[PDB]
Design an enzyme around this catalytic site. Structure first.
Site, short mmCIF file in Angstrom:
data_model
loop_
_atom_site.label_atom_id
_atom_site.label_comp_id
_atom_site.label_asym_id
_atom_site.label_seq_id
_atom_site.Cartn_x
_atom_site.Cartn_y
_atom_site.Cartn_z
CG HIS A 189 -2.09 1.05 1.29
ND1 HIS A 189 -1.65 2.12 2.28
CD2 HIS A 189 -2.93 1.46 0.50
CE1 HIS A 189 -2.80 3.02 2.11
NE2 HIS A 189 -3.47 2.53 0.95
CG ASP A 222 -7.10 4.24 0.17
OD1 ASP A 222 -5.94 4.15 0.31
OD2 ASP A 222 -7.74 5.35 0.43
#
Ligand SMILES: CCc1c(C(=O)C(N)=O)c2c(OCC(=O)O)cccc2n1Cc1ccccc1
Ligand SMILES: CCc1c(C(=O)C(N)=O)c2c(OCC(=O)O)cccc2n1Cc1ccccc1
Ligand SMILES: CCc1c(C(=O)C(N)=O)c2c(OCC(=O)O)cccc2n1Cc1ccccc1
Ligand SMILES: CCc1c(C(=O)C(N)=O)c2c(OCC(=O)O)cccc2n1Cc1ccccc1
Lengths: 122, 122, 122, 122
Positions: free
Chosen positions: C47, C89
């Site tokens: 991420h 996300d």
């Protein structure tokens, strides 16, 4: 003229040409060319190079006819210069629509004007 | 509302909704349904039936949101009445554009006031 | 922004993102990348690498729209940066759910800060 | 209990159970069964019939355990009545999600008792 150009930009992109492209990057909406800041800017760079090839007619103020058929810009059969002028504006309208995804707000309203590099020849 | 409906017709067909479709045939622009005169009139016939099944909102006055993306109308998410109201307006804009090939000014209510028969139920 | 990210993590994992992932391992919730200590930690490593590719928007502070449809995170249409942000996300929320099996509370509360090794490059 | 039921509905549908289903049609969120108004209403009718068979416990009051695992409601093991109760609630949460496509807030009672026919027996 700028009348036809602005209508094509709105028809293709859905954006107001002045508020969205009145002074974007180093080329869009402003006078003269500079090294483009992004893909949207490069559309207006090519468009200015399109204009400078066109003597025998005035790209800024000469009117011409075109039609919106099947959601496509169709330049009316016209004078050689006027037809090429219409094809200049059609190309930049399509180019601006195609690069809406990377349109960057930081480049509008002449934030880049003091930073613009001298442009390479067309 | 009629505000959004008008802009969709402009973006799809390129026509002003008032001048081109403000009173066309037996269904376009006018109030109430009648037997359609041609393919353009039938678009407005279907659209009026689309409005008829909407009860939780006012199709003519209630506002919704939509986007013009890749020369396509994309309705904004909303409650059942407002989303389906946007979809009614979208289908008629596409329909009117698809049937510009047979659009005939003789069905404009200012050229000839048509005699409209009782409509079949939706 | 973190508001949208935190809601996604709750929707996918059922866990509070602050209490479960505010400082987990060498990558989750903390500043900077490190060699992942387990699969949950590697989700946050990927991420952070996802964020590092985004330079036209602000991944920590910029808002975006998404919806919960058929128990699926569906990123709303936006520009390239905000869509890529939402997809970053969504991917970490999904990854964290898949590795709930080996979630180790011993890695919570930034205990492993002195154990963190330099990460492999993205 | 209603606490577990409301959490399931929020997890499955993304909707607040009170504001979306607290008094909808002739069955959802109100006492007693009636002839359903639409598919969403029918989910609550079926759910009320599900509660009717649970005589060894108190469906509205008695707590039970469940987990949100891979975005699925997983009822924990229990005695016959409480396990059946959790499965009643899981089924209505799923049913309500499946029928969001025809959810219409027109059927919300809004503190006006609607016309409700006597329901078919169960
Ligand atoms: C990007 C749009 C644009 C031009 C372009 O398409 C472009 N930068 O190429 C352009 C322009 O360019 C031609 C030239 O430089 O002579 C000159 C002046 C304004 C110009 N607007 C803004 C605008 C056009 C039409 C109606 C309303 C606003
Ligand atoms: C064909 C366009 C149209 C209607 C249709 O699309 C159509 N005839 O279906 C319609 C209309 O119909 C809805 C209804 O009957 O309640 C009612 C009133 C005007 C109507 N204009 C004209 C118009 C619409 C939007 C902006 C400006 C002009
Ligand atoms: C693992 C969850 C997480 C991040 C990650 O998903 C992760 N470590 O990648 C992250 C984060 O990462 C982005 C970055 O470092 O720029 C930065 C700051 C906090 C971060 N929380 C905790 C949190 C997120 C959302 C709401 C409430 C708490
Ligand atoms: C549709 C949701 C629902 C019920 C249903 O799922 C339904 N109508 O079946 C139901 C209900 O039904 C069980 C019964 O009548 O004994 C009784 C009371 C409220 C009921 N809410 C609203 C709600 C439930 C849980 C938390 C917050 C709001």
């Amino acid at each position: 003229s700028l009348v036809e150009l602005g209508k094509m930009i709105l028809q293709e992109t859905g954006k107001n040409p002045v508020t969205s492209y009145g002074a974007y990057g180093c080329n869009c909406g402003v006078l003269g060319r500079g090294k483009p800041k992004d893909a949207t800017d490069r559309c207006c760079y090519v468009h200015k190079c399109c204009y400078k090839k066109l003597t025998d007619c005035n790209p800024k103020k000469d009117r011409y006819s075109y039609s919106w058929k099947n959601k496509t810009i169709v330049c009316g059969e016209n004078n050689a210069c006027l037809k090429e002028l219409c094809e200049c504006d059609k190309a930049v309208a399509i180019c601006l629509r195609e690069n809406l995804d990377t349109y960057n707000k930081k480049y509008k309203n002449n934030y880049l004007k003091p930073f613009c590099d001298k442009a390479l020849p067309c």
